[PDB]
Amino acid sequence: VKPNYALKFTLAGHTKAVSSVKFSPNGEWLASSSADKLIKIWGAYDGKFEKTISGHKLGISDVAWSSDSNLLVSASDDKTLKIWDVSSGKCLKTLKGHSNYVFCCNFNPQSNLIVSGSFDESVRIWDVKTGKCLKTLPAHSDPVSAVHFNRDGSLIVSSSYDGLCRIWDTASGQCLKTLIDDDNPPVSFVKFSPNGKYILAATLDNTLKLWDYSKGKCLKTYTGHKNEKYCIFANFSVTGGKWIVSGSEDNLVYIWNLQTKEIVQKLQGHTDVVISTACHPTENIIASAALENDKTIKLWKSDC
Amino acid sequence: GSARAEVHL
Protein backbone atom coordinates (compact mmCIF):
# COMPACT_ATOMS: atom_id res chain seq x y z
CA VAL A 1 0.00 0.00 0.00
CA LYS A 2 1.08 3.59 -0.68
CA PRO A 3 0.01 6.95 0.81
CA ASN A 4 -1.76 9.69 -1.13
CA TYR A 5 -0.70 12.92 0.55
CA ALA A 6 -2.27 15.95 -1.09
CA LEU A 7 -1.60 19.64 -0.45
CA LYS A 8 -4.29 21.10 1.81
CA PHE A 9 -2.80 24.37 3.11
CA THR A 10 0.15 26.67 2.51
CA LEU A 11 1.16 28.81 5.49
CA ALA A 12 2.72 32.20 4.75
CA GLY A 13 4.10 34.43 7.47
CA HIS A 14 7.82 34.05 8.12
CA THR A 15 9.94 36.74 6.45
CA LYS A 16 13.04 34.58 6.06
CA ALA A 17 13.88 30.91 5.60
CA VAL A 18 11.82 28.63 7.85
CA SER A 19 14.14 26.43 9.93
CA SER A 20 11.97 23.82 11.61
CA VAL A 21 8.35 22.72 12.08
CA LYS A 22 6.97 20.50 14.88
CA PHE A 23 3.46 19.28 15.74
CA SER A 24 2.40 19.55 19.39
CA PRO A 25 2.06 16.16 21.14
CA ASN A 26 -1.67 16.79 21.64
CA GLY A 27 -2.08 17.36 17.91
CA GLU A 28 -3.66 20.79 18.20
CA TRP A 29 -0.79 22.89 16.91
CA LEU A 30 2.16 23.29 14.61
CA ALA A 31 5.09 25.40 15.77
CA SER A 32 7.59 26.81 13.29
CA SER A 33 10.92 28.56 13.82
CA SER A 34 12.70 30.79 11.31
CA ALA A 35 15.82 32.73 10.48
CA ASP A 36 13.53 35.74 11.00
CA LYS A 37 14.04 35.26 14.78
CA LEU A 38 10.42 34.27 15.26
CA ILE A 39 8.35 31.29 16.29
CA LYS A 40 4.85 31.05 14.86
CA ILE A 41 1.99 28.85 16.06
CA TRP A 42 -0.57 27.49 13.57
CA GLY A 43 -3.70 25.36 13.79
CA ALA A 44 -2.62 21.80 13.01
CA TYR A 45 -5.83 20.88 11.17
CA ASP A 46 -6.82 24.10 9.40
CA GLY A 47 -3.38 25.69 9.05
CA LYS A 48 -4.82 28.88 10.53
CA PHE A 49 -2.27 31.30 11.97
CA GLU A 50 -2.57 31.54 15.74
CA LYS A 51 0.16 33.77 17.18
CA THR A 52 3.79 34.87 16.97
CA ILE A 53 6.27 34.31 19.81
CA SER A 54 9.25 36.69 19.82
CA GLY A 55 12.38 37.27 21.88
CA HIS A 56 15.54 35.87 20.27
CA LYS A 57 18.13 38.38 19.07
CA LEU A 58 19.17 36.37 16.01
CA GLY A 59 17.86 33.63 13.73
CA ILE A 60 16.43 30.42 15.16
CA SER A 61 17.56 26.99 13.98
CA ASP A 62 15.25 24.64 15.88
CA VAL A 63 12.19 24.52 18.14
CA ALA A 64 10.63 21.69 20.14
CA TRP A 65 7.57 20.93 22.27
CA SER A 66 7.37 19.66 25.83
CA SER A 67 5.43 16.42 26.41
CA ASP A 68 2.25 18.20 27.55
CA SER A 69 2.24 20.66 24.64
CA ASN A 70 2.52 23.57 27.09
CA LEU A 71 6.12 24.61 26.48
CA LEU A 72 8.50 25.19 23.61
CA VAL A 73 12.27 25.41 23.53
CA SER A 74 14.14 27.14 20.72
CA ALA A 75 17.81 27.17 19.69
CA SER A 76 19.26 30.37 18.20
CA ASP A 77 22.32 31.97 16.61
CA ASP A 78 22.26 34.36 19.58
CA LYS A 79 23.89 31.42 21.39
CA THR A 80 20.95 30.88 23.72
CA LEU A 81 17.97 28.60 24.03
CA LYS A 82 14.69 29.98 25.29
CA ILE A 83 11.92 28.10 27.08
CA TRP A 84 8.47 29.44 26.27
CA ASP A 85 5.04 29.10 27.79
CA VAL A 86 2.95 28.75 24.64
CA SER A 87 -0.37 29.93 26.13
CA SER A 88 1.01 33.20 27.51
CA GLY A 89 3.81 33.60 24.98
CA LYS A 90 6.20 34.41 27.82
CA CYS A 91 9.89 33.51 27.78
CA LEU A 92 10.20 31.56 31.04
CA LYS A 93 13.97 31.10 30.89
CA THR A 94 16.90 31.97 28.64
CA LEU A 95 19.54 29.25 28.72
CA LYS A 96 23.02 30.67 28.49
CA GLY A 97 26.15 28.57 28.39
CA HIS A 98 26.99 27.59 24.84
CA SER A 99 29.86 29.57 23.34
CA ASN A 100 28.60 29.49 19.75
CA TYR A 101 25.31 29.15 17.85
CA VAL A 102 22.82 26.72 19.36
CA PHE A 103 21.66 24.47 16.52
CA CYS A 104 19.34 21.82 17.91
CA CYS A 105 17.23 21.13 20.97
CA ASN A 106 14.73 18.79 22.58
CA PHE A 107 12.90 18.09 25.83
CA ASN A 108 13.28 14.68 27.45
CA PRO A 109 10.16 12.49 27.92
CA GLN A 110 9.21 13.90 31.32
CA SER A 111 10.10 17.38 30.01
CA ASN A 112 12.12 18.20 33.11
CA LEU A 113 15.29 18.36 31.03
CA ILE A 114 16.38 19.98 27.77
CA VAL A 115 19.26 18.78 25.63
CA SER A 116 21.00 21.12 23.21
CA GLY A 117 23.67 20.88 20.53
CA SER A 118 25.86 23.75 19.38
CA PHE A 119 28.48 24.96 16.92
CA ASP A 120 30.74 24.98 19.99
CA GLU A 121 30.92 21.20 19.46
CA SER A 122 29.27 20.38 22.77
CA VAL A 123 26.01 18.95 24.02
CA ARG A 124 24.45 20.52 27.12
CA ILE A 125 21.73 19.20 29.42
CA TRP A 126 19.59 21.81 31.19
CA ASP A 127 17.08 21.79 34.04
CA VAL A 128 13.76 23.10 32.70
CA LYS A 129 12.52 24.50 36.03
CA THR A 130 15.64 26.48 36.97
CA GLY A 131 16.98 27.06 33.47
CA LYS A 132 20.39 26.02 34.75
CA CYS A 133 22.88 23.88 32.84
CA LEU A 134 23.35 20.54 34.58
CA LYS A 135 26.09 19.06 32.40
CA THR A 136 28.28 19.94 29.44
CA LEU A 137 29.46 17.04 27.29
CA PRO A 138 32.56 17.51 25.09
CA ALA A 139 30.65 15.48 22.51
CA HIS A 140 32.17 16.18 19.10
CA SER A 141 34.92 17.89 17.09
CA ASP A 142 32.57 19.87 14.83
CA PRO A 143 29.09 21.44 15.14
CA VAL A 144 26.43 19.24 16.72
CA SER A 145 23.60 18.86 14.20
CA ALA A 146 21.01 17.10 16.35
CA VAL A 147 20.27 15.81 19.84
CA HIS A 148 17.42 13.57 20.99
CA PHE A 149 16.35 11.64 24.10
CA ASN A 150 15.32 7.98 23.89
CA ARG A 151 11.93 6.76 25.13
CA ASP A 152 12.70 6.75 28.86
CA GLY A 153 15.17 9.64 28.74
CA SER A 154 18.13 7.64 30.04
CA LEU A 155 19.97 8.13 26.75
CA ILE A 156 20.79 10.99 24.42
CA VAL A 157 21.85 10.52 20.81
CA SER A 158 23.86 13.25 19.11
CA SER A 159 25.12 13.77 15.58
CA SER A 160 27.80 16.02 14.16
CA TYR A 161 29.54 17.31 11.07
CA ASP A 162 32.50 15.30 12.38
CA GLY A 163 30.83 12.22 10.90
CA LEU A 164 29.88 10.65 14.21
CA CYS A 165 26.68 9.63 15.97
CA ARG A 166 27.21 9.15 19.69
CA ILE A 167 24.92 7.87 22.44
CA TRP A 168 25.28 9.33 25.93
CA ASP A 169 24.11 8.29 29.39
CA THR A 170 21.92 11.18 30.58
CA ALA A 171 22.79 10.70 34.25
CA SER A 172 26.56 10.10 34.02
CA GLY A 173 27.35 11.91 30.78
CA GLN A 174 29.53 9.02 29.65
CA CYS A 175 29.80 8.22 25.95
CA LEU A 176 28.26 4.76 25.65
CA LYS A 177 28.71 4.27 21.92
CA THR A 178 30.03 5.82 18.72
CA LEU A 179 28.32 4.86 15.49
CA ILE A 180 29.79 5.37 12.03
CA ASP A 181 29.58 3.39 8.78
CA ASP A 182 32.13 2.64 6.01
CA ASP A 183 32.35 6.32 5.01
CA ASN A 184 32.71 9.49 7.13
CA PRO A 185 30.26 12.03 5.68
CA PRO A 186 28.89 14.67 8.05
CA VAL A 187 25.93 13.35 10.07
CA SER A 188 23.23 16.00 9.65
CA PHE A 189 20.41 14.56 11.75
CA VAL A 190 19.57 11.76 14.19
CA LYS A 191 16.68 10.65 16.37
CA PHE A 192 15.48 7.55 18.19
CA SER A 193 12.60 5.59 16.67
CA PRO A 194 9.19 5.65 18.43
CA ASN A 195 9.91 2.34 20.18
CA GLY A 196 13.45 3.44 20.99
CA LYS A 197 15.12 0.43 19.36
CA TYR A 198 16.51 2.32 16.39
CA ILE A 199 18.24 5.53 15.45
CA LEU A 200 17.37 7.19 12.15
CA ALA A 201 20.40 9.06 10.86
CA ALA A 202 20.91 11.33 7.87
CA THR A 203 24.33 11.96 6.35
CA LEU A 204 25.31 14.56 3.80
CA ASP A 205 25.87 11.96 1.11
CA ASN A 206 22.20 11.77 0.16
CA THR A 207 21.47 8.98 2.62
CA LEU A 208 19.18 8.08 5.51
CA LYS A 209 19.96 4.99 7.59
CA LEU A 210 18.09 3.06 10.27
CA TRP A 211 20.52 1.78 12.92
CA ASP A 212 19.89 -0.92 15.51
CA TYR A 213 21.15 0.90 18.59
CA SER A 214 21.87 -2.16 20.75
CA LYS A 215 23.69 -4.14 18.04
CA GLY A 216 25.32 -1.00 16.67
CA LYS A 217 24.67 -1.87 13.04
CA CYS A 218 22.91 -0.37 10.03
CA LEU A 219 19.70 -2.25 9.21
CA LYS A 220 18.23 -0.22 6.37
CA THR A 221 19.25 2.60 4.05
CA TYR A 222 16.91 5.04 2.32
CA THR A 223 18.08 6.79 -0.84
CA GLY A 224 16.72 8.65 -3.84
CA HIS A 225 16.60 12.18 -2.46
CA LYS A 226 19.14 14.99 -2.47
CA ASN A 227 20.91 15.97 0.75
CA GLU A 228 24.50 17.21 0.67
CA LYS A 229 24.34 20.73 2.16
CA TYR A 230 21.67 21.25 4.82
CA CYS A 231 20.71 19.54 8.05
CA ILE A 232 17.29 18.33 6.96
CA PHE A 233 15.02 16.66 9.53
CA ALA A 234 13.64 13.16 9.02
CA ASN A 235 10.61 11.50 10.61
CA PHE A 236 8.87 8.23 11.36
CA SER A 237 5.27 8.39 10.15
CA VAL A 238 3.23 6.02 12.30
CA THR A 239 -0.40 7.15 12.02
CA GLY A 240 -1.20 5.12 8.91
CA GLY A 241 1.35 3.17 6.91
CA LYS A 242 4.83 3.05 8.47
CA TRP A 243 6.93 5.48 6.44
CA ILE A 244 10.14 7.49 6.68
CA VAL A 245 9.65 11.14 5.71
CA SER A 246 12.23 13.77 4.77
CA GLY A 247 12.75 17.01 2.90
CA SER A 248 15.19 17.22 0.02
CA GLU A 249 17.47 19.71 -1.70
CA ASP A 250 15.48 19.27 -4.91
CA ASN A 251 12.52 21.02 -3.22
CA LEU A 252 10.52 17.85 -2.69
CA VAL A 253 9.27 15.84 0.26
CA TYR A 254 10.24 12.17 0.04
CA ILE A 255 8.29 9.32 1.62
CA TRP A 256 9.73 5.79 1.85
CA ASN A 257 8.21 2.51 2.97
CA LEU A 258 10.18 1.85 6.16
CA GLN A 259 10.28 -1.92 5.73
CA THR A 260 10.96 -2.19 1.97
CA LYS A 261 12.93 1.06 1.61
CA GLU A 262 11.08 1.89 -1.61
CA ILE A 263 10.02 5.46 -2.36
CA VAL A 264 6.23 5.54 -2.14
CA GLN A 265 5.59 9.21 -2.86
CA LYS A 266 7.21 12.58 -3.56
CA LEU A 267 5.45 15.82 -2.66
CA GLN A 268 5.94 18.67 -5.12
CA GLY A 269 5.14 22.32 -4.46
CA HIS A 270 7.90 24.14 -2.57
CA THR A 271 10.22 26.49 -4.47
CA ASP A 272 13.33 25.94 -2.34
CA VAL A 273 15.04 23.28 -0.21
CA VAL A 274 12.61 21.52 2.15
CA ILE A 275 14.60 21.86 5.38
CA SER A 276 12.07 20.39 7.77
CA THR A 277 9.12 18.01 7.93
CA ALA A 278 6.92 16.74 10.77
CA CYS A 279 4.21 14.09 11.08
CA HIS A 280 0.99 14.69 13.03
CA PRO A 281 0.59 12.38 16.06
CA THR A 282 -2.89 11.06 15.21
CA GLU A 283 -3.88 12.14 11.70
CA ASN A 284 -2.04 11.30 8.48
CA ILE A 285 -0.82 14.85 8.12
CA ILE A 286 2.61 16.07 7.08
CA ALA A 287 3.93 19.59 7.54
CA SER A 288 6.86 20.72 5.42
CA ALA A 289 8.91 23.93 5.46
CA ALA A 290 11.36 25.47 3.00
CA LEU A 291 14.26 27.91 2.88
CA GLU A 292 14.81 31.54 1.79
CA ASN A 293 13.37 31.47 -1.75
CA ASP A 294 10.15 29.86 -0.53
CA LYS A 295 9.55 30.91 3.10
CA THR A 296 6.34 28.89 3.39
CA ILE A 297 5.04 25.89 5.29
CA LYS A 298 2.74 23.34 3.66
CA LEU A 299 0.27 20.90 5.17
CA TRP A 300 -0.42 17.70 3.27
CA LYS A 301 -3.10 15.13 4.14
CA SER A 302 -3.45 11.45 3.24
CA ASP A 303 -6.17 8.83 3.73
CA CYS A 304 -3.56 6.26 4.81
CA GLY B 1 19.61 34.18 8.88
CA SER B 2 20.26 31.18 11.11
CA ALA B 3 22.79 28.34 11.14
CA ARG B 4 20.36 25.71 9.83
CA ALA B 5 19.39 27.87 6.84
CA GLU B 6 23.07 28.19 5.90
CA VAL B 7 25.59 25.78 4.38
CA HIS B 8 28.49 24.68 6.58
CA LEU B 9 31.88 23.62 5.22
Curated annotation (Swiss-Prot), chain A:
Phenotypic consequence of residue 103 to D: Strongly reduced affinity for histone H3
GO molecular function, one term: histone H3K4me1 reader activity
Gene3D superfamilies, per database record: YVTN repeat-like/Quinoprotein amine dehydrogenase
GO CC annotation terms, alphabetical: ATAC complex; histone acetyltransferase complex; histone methyltransferase complex; mitotic spindle; MLL1 complex; MLL1/2 complex; MLL3/4 complex; NSL complex
Pfam families given in the database record: Beta-prop_WDR5
Result when mutating residue 178 to M: Found in a patient with childhood apraxia of speech; uncertain significance
Known outcome of mutating residue 210 to K: Loss of interaction with RBBP5 and reduced ability to stimulate KMT2A methyltransferase activity in association with RBBP5 and ASH2L
UniProt keyword terms in alphabetical order: Acetylation, Chromatin regulator, Host-virus interaction, Isopeptide bond, Nucleus, Repeat, Transcription, Transcription regulation, Ubl conjugation, WD repeat
InterPro entries (alphabetical): G-protein_beta_WD-40_rep, WD40/YVTN_repeat-like_dom_sf, WD40_repeat_CS, WD40_repeat_dom_sf, WD40_rpt
Main location: nucleus
Parts forming coiled coils: none
GO biological process: gluconeogenesis; negative regulation of transcription by RNA polymerase II; positive regulation of DNA-templated transcription; positive regulation of gluconeogenesis; regulation of cell cycle; regulation of cell division; regulation of DNA-templated transcription; regulation of embryonic development
Stated consequence of mutating residue 103 to A: Strongly reduced affinity for histone H3. Significant decrease in interaction with KMT2A
Annotated site, Important for interaction with histone H3, chain positions: 77, 103, 233, 292
Reported impact of residue 291 to A: Abolishes histone H3 binding
Subcellular location: Nucleus
Record note on what altering residue 103 to L does: Strongly reduced affinity for histone H3
Segments annotated as WD repeats: 13-52, 55-96, 98-138, 139-178, 182-223, 226-266, 269-303
PROSITE patterns associated with the record: WD_REPEATS_1, WD_REPEATS_2, WD_REPEATS_REGION
Keyword Repeat annotated: yes
Location of cross-link Glycyl lysine isopeptide (Lys-Gly) (interchain with G-Cter in SUMO2): 16
PANTHER family assigned: WD REPEAT-CONTAINING PROTEIN 5, WD40 REPEAT PROTEIN
Protein family: Belongs to the WD repeat WDR5/wds family.
Assembly and oligomerization: Interacts with PAXBP1; the interaction is direct and links a WDR5-containing histone methyltransferase complex to PAX7 and PAX3. Interacts with HCFC1. Component of the ATAC complex, a complex with histone acetyltransferase activity on histones H3 and H4. Component of the SET1 complex, at least composed of the catalytic subunit (SETD1A or SETD1B), WDR5, WDR82, RBBP5, ASH2L/ASH2, CXXC1/CFP1, HCFC1 and DPY30. Core component of several methyltransferase-containing complexes including MLL1/MLL, MLL2/3 (also named ASCOM complex) and MLL4/WBP7. (Microbial infection) Interacts with herpes virus 8/HHV-8 protein LANA1; this interaction regulates the MLL1 histone methyltransferase activity on viral DNA.
Protein name (database record): WD repeat-containing protein 5
Source organism per UniProt: Homo sapiens
Gene name, Swiss-Prot/TrEMBL: WDR5
Swiss-Prot record, chain B:
Localization: Nucleus
Cysteine pairs bridged by disulfides in the record: none
Effect after changing residue 4 to A: Loss of interaction with the WRAD complex and WDR5
Effect of residue 8 to A/F: Slight decrease in interaction with WDR5
Site (Important for WDR5-recognition and binding): 4
Extent of motif WDR5 interaction motif (WIN): 1-6
Highest taxon of the lineage: Eukaryota
Protein name per Swiss-Prot or TrEMBL: MLL cleavage product C180
Organism: Homo sapiens
Source organism phylogeny: Eukaryota, Metazoa, Chordata, Craniata, Vertebrata
Gene assigned in the entry: KMT2A
